[PDB]
Amino acid sequence: ERDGLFCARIFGPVKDYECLCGKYKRLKHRGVICEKCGVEVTQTKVRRERMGHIELASPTAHIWFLKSLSRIGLLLDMPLRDIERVLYFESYVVIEGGMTNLERQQILTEEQYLDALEEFGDEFDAKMGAEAIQALLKSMDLEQECEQLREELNETNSETKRKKLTKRIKLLEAFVQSGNKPEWMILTVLPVLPPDLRPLVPLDGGRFATSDLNDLYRRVINRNNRLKRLLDLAAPDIIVRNEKRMLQEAVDALLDNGRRGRAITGSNKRPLKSLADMIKGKQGRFRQNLLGKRVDYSGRSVITVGYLRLHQCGLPKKMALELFKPFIYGKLELRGLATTIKAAKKMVEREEAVVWDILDEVIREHPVLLNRAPTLHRLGIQAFEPVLIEGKAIQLHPLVCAAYNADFDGDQMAVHVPLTLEAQLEARALMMSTNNILSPANGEPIIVPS
Amino acid sequence: IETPITANFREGLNVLQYFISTHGARKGLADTALKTANSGYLTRRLVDVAQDLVVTEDDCGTHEGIMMTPVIEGGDVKEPLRDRVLGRVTAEDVLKPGTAD
Amino acid sequence: YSYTEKKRIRKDFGKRPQVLDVPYLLSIQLDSFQKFIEQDPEGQYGLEAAFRSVFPIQSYSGNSELQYVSYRLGEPVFDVQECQIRGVTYSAPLRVKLRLVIYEREAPEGTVKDIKEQEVYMGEIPLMTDNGTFVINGTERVIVSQLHRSPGVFFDSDKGKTHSSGKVLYNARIIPYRGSWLDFEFDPKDNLFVRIDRRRKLPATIILRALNYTTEQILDLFFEKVIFEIRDNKLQMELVPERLRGETASFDIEANGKVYVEKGRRITARHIRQLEKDDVKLIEVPVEYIAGKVVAKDYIDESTGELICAANMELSLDLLAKLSQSGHKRIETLFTNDLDHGPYISETLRVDPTNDRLSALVEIYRMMRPGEPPTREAAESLFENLFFSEDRYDLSAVGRMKFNRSLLREEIEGSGILSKDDIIDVMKKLIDIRNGKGEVDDIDHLGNRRIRSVGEMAENQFRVGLVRVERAVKERLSLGDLDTLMPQDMINAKPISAAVKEFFGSSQLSQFMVQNNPLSEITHKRRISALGPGGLTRERAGFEVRDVHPTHYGRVCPIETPEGPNIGLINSLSVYAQTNEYGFLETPYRKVTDGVVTDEIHYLSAIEEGNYVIAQANSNLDEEGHFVEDLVTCRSKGESSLFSRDQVDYMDVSTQQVVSVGASLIPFLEHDDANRALMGANMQRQAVPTLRADKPLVGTGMERAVAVDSGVTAVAKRGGVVQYVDASRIVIKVNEDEMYPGEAGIDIYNLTKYTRSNQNTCINQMPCVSLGEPVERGDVLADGPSTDLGELALGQNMRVAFMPWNGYNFEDSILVSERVVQEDRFTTIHIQELACVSRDTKLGPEEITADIPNVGEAALSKLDESGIVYIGAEVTGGDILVGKVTPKGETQLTPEEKLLRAIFGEKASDVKDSSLRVPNGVSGTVIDVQVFTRDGVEKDKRALEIEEMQLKQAKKDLSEELQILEAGLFSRIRAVLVAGGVEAEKLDKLPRDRWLELGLTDEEKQNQLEQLAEQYDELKHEFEKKLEAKRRKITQGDDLAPGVLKIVKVYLAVKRRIQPGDKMAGRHGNKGVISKINPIEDMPYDENGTPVDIVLNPLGVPSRMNIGQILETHLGMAAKGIGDKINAMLKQQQEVAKLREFIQRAYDLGADVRQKVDLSTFSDEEVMRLAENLRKGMPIATPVFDGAKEAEIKELLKLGDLPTSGQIRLYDGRTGEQFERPVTVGYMYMLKLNHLVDDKMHARSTGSYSLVTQQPLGGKAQFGGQRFGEMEVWALEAYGAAYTLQEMLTVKSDDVNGRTKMYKNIVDGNHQMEPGMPESFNVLLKEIRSLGINIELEDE
Amino acid sequence: IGLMKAVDKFEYRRGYKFSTYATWWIRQAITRSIADQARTIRIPVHMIETINKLNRISRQMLQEMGREPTPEELAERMLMPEDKIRKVLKIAKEPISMETPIGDDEDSHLGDFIEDTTLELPLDSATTESLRAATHDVLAGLTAREAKVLRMR
Known part of the structure; x- marks a missing residue:
């Protein structure tokens, strides 16, 4: 829908080079925006790039710089518990004391605050909510703290507080050149993930499934618009506090589900995985998608013993045509046996006698990497010049089993073919089994008969 | 247990003997099924502090370095100087027991 | 012997007799579920207990309530067959009737206002299978038994937790069956603190003040009274002699006229003896002696009534004078001790900040529900609900009995609610342990763990469902109608059924049953898990739950467990293990009475085992006299020693009761290390049944029991004679001694042909009986998938050598012959299935047709005009079994393809091919086509033909059933007309119809003919009634998922031979893979010419500590030598009597074997048929620990005309020379594992890609690529090959614009690298930016 | 509110x-x-009420019959054509997750089993490139006037 969570105007078209209705299409109009709907026409890759924003009514506090250690408490030199008390709309804070009775950054209870109201009123400035913390950050000055704290620190060299003053000095100094105004701490506008990365995809059985991030976005928007509706309706402050707490809790759970409060779950009572969880831990992207990756042009099979030479490996003839399929296609057109790539694939599927004739030269002088999980040390991966075997299993040289710590009791090996010229070169020059005779740990040989 | 398994596999074992021996079997395999995770975590931690350890120069020309000695302390000689310096570069002009050599 | 035993007699080597037969192995499931099924109006178990524990439930006003009267389980709507066929859970409806007691509040006791009663249907429970599994969504599943800590009280200790003190902190523990927990913990400061549900600690005083306990009566129970008196001048005290134990006399003690212990001197036991001797009790005491004690009474002066000194106060010198002047010579104090009576309770009062009930309850409310302000009644209600509400707390009878017996109580019954005295006793027992008087128990000891079976889990889930019903009933009563609200109109059955099916299939302990072998099924049913709801987790698994507690002897096999992360968590119970009424494992025992071992069986739980001394099964009986050793090796108190003949009280039943059923199947186990046996026991469950079932030569004697108890074979219920046997139907005429006087008493046995298993294996039954032969009761008729004549035949047996062969058996590798492939010994059958979903897409409904564009007609030659492949057609991967065309969308034509369409004119219609194709690498035969259509949509011609064939079969089978049923029923109908006169001149000449109008006689035969007509009408209306339902069932539509039109299911029977790479496993943990198929002429052979067909690496024998396999090999050669003599003399036929003499000489070789079998009791045919089964080698039995010693093998080899050593000289298959050393050659039972080589081979050049990360998918079934983890990334970067590592992360997985170029240029023969930004990093940047954390790339 | x-x-x-x-x-x-x-995909109140009525009708049906609701048997109480109930039942698709533990451990979520069904195979691009070269050379094989207008059209 328009101005929804997948609004094509904000994020882009759902299909390549197509608008919402069909006024402009077929590249007749390159990048016009359909006046009937408002959708720019371009590729669908733009949906991975474009991001939207959520405009909040009441500023809300980020959870990382609040719960983790404090980064919002150290900057304000305030107790962590009092920060939570003020956040939950329970304890006032004196932003500015016009009189000498009050003081900046004072904890206040409601009953104690009524006395201030009946005494002074307009002279002082003390209010409630996260926006009070935002105003405190706006009002404070860090250069004065730089010129003040450093001088008084030298006066009393208490070691128990020396590190605390040092930490404050380091923080204010780091803020000096960062150009980073701490007023951006309290979130007022919140960016939304691109829809292609929080995908809601139909299943084959007419079903759907979507990332929990979509649920959290819906949850924050539902109460954000309600908060908007509670202002023109002149809601009592008791219920506006509750709504603002709802919004703060929702954005906190969006950033991190089980960090500040109870982990918000779905309909399966399992905690919803926030986007911070998408990058944290073994299941995070840094480990499972950036360092450890699925790879192409690779396969797996059981291992078996070989008569083979030290640089030779026993490949099953059936896996070679699958692995080197693009190589077969490339050398088949060079041979001129297939005018088009379609015919190449067709005759590969038929498995004619010609493909094996081409195969016996594609494989040779082309080393292929072998892998055994887990790869303890460097010798867990070694290059091997393939030898085609009309079988089903991979034949391995007996003398390298000790290095692989592999026994022919059902162990599986991972095969990896290098593609680029340097990789085919790096494997032969440096990764070849003939090169590796001594262990990296010590000069003791590793090709010992077992 | 002060009662040992007097029999061997060729003669066969006793029911109580087998029940006694199974503790060593379970305990031996339980750690393998469990302590390999510790080894993996240790290796993961080790490779992190070993990230940017690449050779940059050939000879930085630094001054004297570390002492070297056998391991005669405690018991006999286990790692002599013959094995602990194979693959080292000297720091100072080491001279034989014959002086100025 | 049974009749089938006459066909094959397995020679045994059991020496000690076998007293108690092994029980029905699946008893722990059927017996547990029986209590769930049946109704016990006086016994509280199963559904009746669950219903009575909740009902009656009343309205909030109390004016109405529900009464539980009775319930009934409805008939299953479908049988187990159509339940699997339709993929629907096999269950029965639950029908329960209730009563409505309604009050009207205008009358005081107006109970008679309105009564509503009817049977209400709520929930459907899955019903019990005859073989002990379940059918969930048409899938064969079982629920494993869980082992959890039994409810009750337990005490623990800490070793090294408090580093500062080094003390050991004892702690109590209250574990109810359901509800909140209770914990009592000590401190390094000797303070008692209470932790409810793992919350913070609270002083033990505060919980007592909640129970209406004042300080005086709090300390009255926990300590003693030390009265202090004043004789108007000096202090006096009552001294107990046994209180000043090993202490120091602060003041010089005295007596009436004697001084006993001097000042600053230790009080000896001799002085205690003297104090007992003279019995002097009143000893003058100084003021300093009392200064340091705590008062046990508040004290006032009645003149003014103001408090002088409060309780729990340590008095001073003036305080004593304060009471002496106030007139108080009656002074009592606490009894404090450093050794035996610690003042922990009194010290706890010093820390307790509460003074009475109200403050204690306020603190408890703040404890459970922080933040909420406490009120007068909310705290009371919460505390009452914590441990005194029946709805929210229970201990169960087992929990109650453990709770009482842990406190050395006499009561077995009790209440599920904690009382004051119970908690008080718990505190006192914990304090006694802390002081020293007492000890601590142990956790992993089996007396503290309870086996929970499936019936109890289902009852608990049903209780949860009833609690769900409560939240609906309690609102309708206070709001709904009072005179017309009929009970069915207010009970919602949806949540109960939803919760029941949630536990059945979606839980942790309900998984697909491993159906590879009968052994696999039987060992999966008899499995114990320590996981699931309320159990442990492998991450939370330490060592005490993994190690073998000594109490496991006889209950759980120490080596029947997996070897993964759950090595100690998954267990299997022993052969003879049983379960108590409470859920504890007890093993049978034979009792020793005055040295005489009676054969009556007693059962002892874990707790009672340690009390008595128990001898093992190793004691030789002197014919019901005594043993043979005056000192008998026995085990008592958890340890083994030697004891006299008169000490032992119980004996083990048999030597097989320690191991499980799977472990009991390994012969020569005592000669094998536990390490190898551990994996071998699991692996023998991984076998796959072959084409022919080969009886194992070296068995164990438990095969003939496991095969019958597995339930997969066709066992004969009643004895009879085979009357009519077909390839799938067996009919046996029951003899007249078992006929019931009502029926024709003829059974049928409809066998099941080739059927898919849960692991895509074969499930087939072949009959083993012939026509017209007798059969006994409980005997087998048709062998199972992997059984031979009622004996478990897991694999094959063949010649086995032990020698290296040119390195082809280098590291556990296994070399085979071409002969085994030619003889198809290890060829197996695998049955797969495929599904062609046809849904209604918004672009147009899908359809199944043979009109598919862009496909040759030759490939379509195997389909009918409806587009479905014929039955029996051979198919290969890539072929189209069924066609399916989806409506193509509108395609945006590129500028090039428009040119092609303009020139050649081929316009692509509104059709897109989505047809089903065979998975690659599969070459099988389609043996079944199952099509299911929705109601309303027209079914194709193939559906119309399949339903016609189903109707004709469902009529033919019923007609055959009736005629065979009437084949014996006519023996009454025709014969009643022959009684009282034979009319063969006119009765049999006329047809059976013309048998009713015979010669007319008096009224007697008319009264017989009216019964005859009644029987004929019974025949008329007993048959077609069931046929109508079947007719409207095959033609009936099906219940399918929303959106689909029709589903087509096909079955491929893949036949697999053995290829190099397949896992070959023995029964001694000696596994490997096939390396090379060897031609017959190349393998080693002997001078007799017979070539060994499998060569095993001998180096894996000594280092692996598995020597039982060598004994198995020698015994196999002995058995095969016996067979080679038997068939040799059979082909010559010297004499039947000569054969009867030779086999008889063969069956008497053991010194004291149990079996004395005489062949003089047989006939010529009875020995001919016996020798026919032994023609291939005679089977030999071997108990687990009563195996044959080497002398028996030597005697058998001498009988077999074979070398006594056991190894023979061989010639090479290549150069034909004798080897320098003789080679051990024999027969060993080989097995084929489920890890097939083709199931592991996978390769992906360019296929599926992930959605969110754009990387290649994972898994062979998904055609995904291998995962290149960081572990191998470190190896790559250690090598230094950066280009390879770069291409692993850029052009292999995550470059949309990079890998396309990588493909195109290598197609153009250009190995040029054009990398780019990985796509898995843009996602990370976008996510971090979504965190409100700005991140850019500082360019140049 | x-x-x-x-x-x-x-x-x-x-x-x-x-x-x-x-x-x-x-x-x-x-x-x-x-x-x-309260729903990922909003349904207007009319069809939500129809779903509620259908649920009540099915409950009251199994109150007495105890079996599943035949859509033909559902026509008696709904008083509407049988296409409407099927259309309503098509709407019961509640999204599950990308993070459902479809496997056994926390190592196989559902996001590892969903194909990106919006991409073309590299074989398609390779064939397109070869086809483009063929079109270019055959256009070069013609005279300019027909080749120009052919590309124009």
Whole structure:
């Protein structure tokens, strides 16, 4: 829908080079925006790039710089518990004391605050909510703290507080050149993930499934618009506090589900995985998608013993045509046996006698990497010049089993073919089994008969 | 247990003997099924502090370095100087027991 | 012997007799579920207990309530067959009737206002299978038994937790069956603190003040009274002699006229003896002696009534004078001790900040529900609900009995609610342990763990469902109608059924049953898990739950467990293990009475085992006299020693009761290390049944029991004679001694042909009986998938050598012959299935047709005009079994393809091919086509033909059933007309119809003919009634998922031979893979010419500590030598009597074997048929620990005309020379594992890609690529090959614009690298930016 | 929010109590929220009410019969064509997750088993490139005037 969570105007078209209705299409109009709907026409890759924003009514506090250690408490030199008390709309804070009775950054209870109201009123400035913390950050000055704290620190060299003053000095100094105004701490506008990365995809059985991030976005928007509706309706402050707490809790759970409060779950009572969880831990992207990756042009099979030479490996003839399929296609057109790539694939599927004739030269002088999980040390991966075997299993040289710590009791090996010229070169020059005779740990040989 | 398994596999074992021996079997395999995770975590931690350890120069020309000695302390000689310096570069002009050599 | 035993007699080597037969192995499931099924109006178990524990439930006003009267389980709507066929859970409806007691509040006791009663249907429970599994969504599943800590009280200790003190902190523990927990913990400061549900600690005083306990009566129970008196001048005290134990006399003690212990001197036991001797009790005491004690009474002066000194106060010198002047010579104090009576309770009062009930309850409310302000009644209600509400707390009878017996109580019954005295006793027992008087128990000891079976889990889930019903009933009563609200109109059955099916299939302990072998099924049913709801987790698994507690002897096999992360968590119970009424494992025992071992069986739980001394099964009986050793090796108190003949009280039943059923199947186990046996026991469950079932030569004697108890074979219920046997139907005429006087008493046995298993294996039954032969009761008729004549035949047996062969058996590798492939010994059958979903897409409904564009007609030659492949057609991967065309969308034509369409004119219609194709690498035969259509949509011609064939079969089978049923029923109908006169001149000449109008006689035969007509009408209306339902069932539509039109299911029977790479496993943990198929002429052979067909690496024998396999090999050669003599003399036929003499000489070789079998009791045919089964080698039995010693093998080899050593000289298959050393050659039972080589081979050049990360998918079934983890990334970067590592992360997985170029240029023969930004990093940047954390790339 | 709306709608002169008139507005607000909100894919209130009625009808059906609801047997109570119930049942697709533990451990979520069904195979691009070269050379094989107009059209 328009101005929804997948609004094509904000994020882009759902299909390549197509608008919402069909006024402009077929590249007749390159990048016009359909006046009937408002959708720019371009590729669908733009949906991975474009991001939207959520405009909040009441500023809300980020959870990382609040719960983790404090980064919002150290900057304000305030107790962590009092920060939570003020956040939950329970304890006032004196932003500015016009009189000498009050003081900046004072904890206040409601009953104690009524006395201030009946005494002074307009002279002082003390209010409630996260926006009070935002105003405190706006009002404070860090250069004065730089010129003040450093001088008084030298006066009393208490070691128990020396590190605390040092930490404050380091923080204010780091803020000096960062150009980073701490007023951006309290979130007022919140960016939304691109829809292609929080995908809601139909299943084959007419079903759907979507990332929990979509649920959290819906949850924050539902109460954000309600908060908007509670202002023109002149809601009592008791219920506006509750709504603002709802919004703060929702954005906190969006950033991190089980960090500040109870982990918000779905309909399966399992905690919803926030986007911070998408990058944290073994299941995070840094480990499972950036360092450890699925790879192409690779396969797996059981291992078996070989008569083979030290640089030779026993490949099953059936896996070679699958692995080197693009190589077969490339050398088949060079041979001129297939005018088009379609015919190449067709005759590969038929498995004619010609493909094996081409195969016996594609494989040779082309080393292929072998892998055994887990790869303890460097010798867990070694290059091997393939030898085609009309079988089903991979034949391995007996003398390298000790290095692989592999026994022919059902162990599986991972095969990896290098593609680029340097990789085919790096494997032969440096990764070849003939090169590796001594262990990296010590000069003791590793090709010992077992 | 002060009662040992007097029999061997060729003669066969006793029911109580087998029940006694199974503790060593379970305990031996339980750690393998469990302590390999510790080894993996240790290796993961080790490779992190070993990230940017690449050779940059050939000879930085630094001054004297570390002492070297056998391991005669405690018991006999286990790692002599013959094995602990194979693959080292000297720091100072080491001279034989014959002086100025 | 049974009749089938006459066909094959397995020679045994059991020496000690076998007293108690092994029980029905699946008893722990059927017996547990029986209590769930049946109704016990006086016994509280199963559904009746669950219903009575909740009902009656009343309205909030109390004016109405529900009464539980009775319930009934409805008939299953479908049988187990159509339940699997339709993929629907096999269950029965639950029908329960209730009563409505309604009050009207205008009358005081107006109970008679309105009564509503009817049977209400709520929930459907899955019903019990005859073989002990379940059918969930048409899938064969079982629920494993869980082992959890039994409810009750337990005490623990800490070793090294408090580093500062080094003390050991004892702690109590209250574990109810359901509800909140209770914990009592000590401190390094000797303070008692209470932790409810793992919350913070609270002083033990505060919980007592909640129970209406004042300080005086709090300390009255926990300590003693030390009265202090004043004789108007000096202090006096009552001294107990046994209180000043090993202490120091602060003041010089005295007596009436004697001084006993001097000042600053230790009080000896001799002085205690003297104090007992003279019995002097009143000893003058100084003021300093009392200064340091705590008062046990508040004290006032009645003149003014103001408090002088409060309780729990340590008095001073003036305080004593304060009471002496106030007139108080009656002074009592606490009894404090450093050794035996610690003042922990009194010290706890010093820390307790509460003074009475109200403050204690306020603190408890703040404890459970922080933040909420406490009120007068909310705290009371919460505390009452914590441990005194029946709805929210229970201990169960087992929990109650453990709770009482842990406190050395006499009561077995009790209440599920904690009382004051119970908690008080718990505190006192914990304090006694802390002081020293007492000890601590142990956790992993089996007396503290309870086996929970499936019936109890289902009852608990049903209780949860009833609690769900409560939240609906309690609102309708206070709001709904009072005179017309009929009970069915207010009970919602949806949540109960939803919760029941949630536990059945979606839980942790309900998984697909491993159906590879009968052994696999039987060992999966008899499995114990320590996981699931309320159990442990492998991450939370330490060592005490993994190690073998000594109490496991006889209950759980120490080596029947997996070897993964759950090595100690998954267990299997022993052969003879049983379960108590409470859920504890007890093993049978034979009792020793005055040295005489009676054969009556007693059962002892874990707790009672340690009390008595128990001898093992190793004691030789002197014919019901005594043993043979005056000192008998026995085990008592958890340890083994030697004891006299008169000490032992119980004996083990048999030597097989320690191991499980799977472990009991390994012969020569005592000669094998536990390490190898551990994996071998699991692996023998991984076998796959072959084409022919080969009886194992070296068995164990438990095969003939496991095969019958597995339930997969066709066992004969009643004895009879085979009357009519077909390839799938067996009919046996029951003899007249078992006929019931009502029926024709003829059974049928409809066998099941080739059927898919849960692991895509074969499930087939072949009959083993012939026509017209007798059969006994409980005997087998048709062998199972992997059984031979009622004996478990897991694999094959063949010649086995032990020698290296040119390195082809280098590291556990296994070399085979071409002969085994030619003889198809290890060829197996695998049955797969495929599904062609046809849904209604918004672009147009899908359809199944043979009109598919862009496909040759030759490939379509195997389909009918409806587009479905014929039955029996051979198919290969890539072929189209069924066609399916989806409506193509509108395609945006590129500028090039428009040119092609303009020139050649081929316009692509509104059709897109989505047809089903065979998975690659599969070459099988389609043996079944199952099509299911929705109601309303027209079914194709193939559906119309399949339903016609189903109707004709469902009529033919019923007609055959009736005629065979009437084949014996006519023996009454025709014969009643022959009684009282034979009319063969006119009765049999006329047809059976013309048998009713015979010669007319008096009224007697008319009264017989009216019964005859009644029987004929019974025949008329007993048959077609069931046929109508079947007719409207095959033609009936099906219940399918929303959106689909029709589903087509096909079955491929893949036949697999053995290829190099397949896992070959023995029964001694000696596994490997096939390396090379060897031609017959190349393998080693002997001078007799017979070539060994499998060569095993001998180096894996000594280092692996598995020597039982060598004994198995020698015994196999002995058995095969016996067979080679038997068939040799059979082909010559010297004499039947000569054969009867030779086999008889063969069956008497053991010194004291149990079996004395005489062949003089047989006939010529009875020995001919016996020798026919032994023609291939005679089977030999071997108990687990009563195996044959080497002398028996030597005697058998001498009988077999074979070398006594056991190894023979061989010639090479290549150069034909004798080897320098003789080679051990024999027969060993080989097995084929489920890890097939083709199931592991996978390769992906360019296929599926992930959605969110754009990387290649994972898994062979998904055609995904291998995962290149960081572990191998470190190896790559250690090598230094950066280009390879770069291409692993850029052009292999995550470059949309990079890998396309990588493909195109290598197609153009250009190995040029054009990398780019990985796509898995843009996602990370976008996510971090979504965190409100700005991140850019500082360019140049 | 619903309670605020009943404040001015309430009149003391009506001769009624407050809770009776407040409950209607509060329940209306709750139903409107649970209908318009509380779902990933919003269904208008009419079809939500039809789903509620269908659920009640099925419950009352199994009250007496105890079997599943035949859509033909559902026509008696719905008084509407049988296409409507099928269309409603097509709407019961509630999204599950990308992070459902479809496997056994926390190592195989559902996001590892969903194909990106919006990409073309590299074989398709390779064939397109070869086809483009073929078109270019055959256009070069013609005279300029026909090749130019052929590319124009």
